[PDB]
Amino acid sequence: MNVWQVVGYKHSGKTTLMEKWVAAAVREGWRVGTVKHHGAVATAVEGDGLLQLHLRRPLWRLDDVLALYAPLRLDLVLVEGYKQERHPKVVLVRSEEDWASLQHLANIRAVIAWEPLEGPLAHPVFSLADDDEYIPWLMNEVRTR
């Protein structure tokens, strides 16, 4: 599966990125899946092609969720959070301070920030306001799989 992660602290801009990225993928006609980290064991309500499920387990790992997505022939799965996982990721930062604690994550492909960052940077950095540029860039990154 083509899995990508969106990581960042509260109000970093991940909601804006997730929304715009999902919308562009949908417009291209892609089959998209998203995962976000927040007494019957399981409940399900179904109607009109839409299945709603509530499943309980001591602990859900991202891989448990992606295993449930496997059968759905998805072209792209956008994951918000699970920063320890190693899928290619876009890091959203509000400040140099946010970046200092997030720069050591694995497989970072790009940074979208509120302001410019200090020191050297091995990844392209975009302004959160510049989606006209980062969305087409990201879509291309996904396509060139």
As its CATH architecture, domain 2-145 has: 3-Layer(aba) Sandwich (3.40)
Q: Which residues contact 73 (CB under 8 A, 6 or more apart)?
A: 31
In eight-state DSSP terms, residue 13 is S
- The tokens for 11 are 């109000």
Q: Where exactly are the structural domains of the chain? A: 2-145
Which H or E run includes 55?
strand 50-55
Task: Report d(CA 93, CA 14) in Å as an integer.
Answer: 9
Q: What is the resolution of this structure in A?
A: 2.1
Rounded CA separation 15/13 (Å): 5
Helix (H), strand (E) at residue 97: helix 96-102
* Cα–Cα dist 76/33, whole Å: 6
Tokens 């083509």 correspond to: 2
Question: What span, in angstroms and rounded, lies between the C-alpha atoms of 108 and 126?
Answer: 14
Residue 128, token pair as written in the block: 């959160």
The whole-angstrom separation of Cα 58 and Cα 131 is: 38
How far is residue 44 from each of residues 34, 38, 117, measured CA to CA in Å? 19, 19, 46
- The answer to whether the Cα torsion of 117, 101, 20, 141 is positive or negative is positive
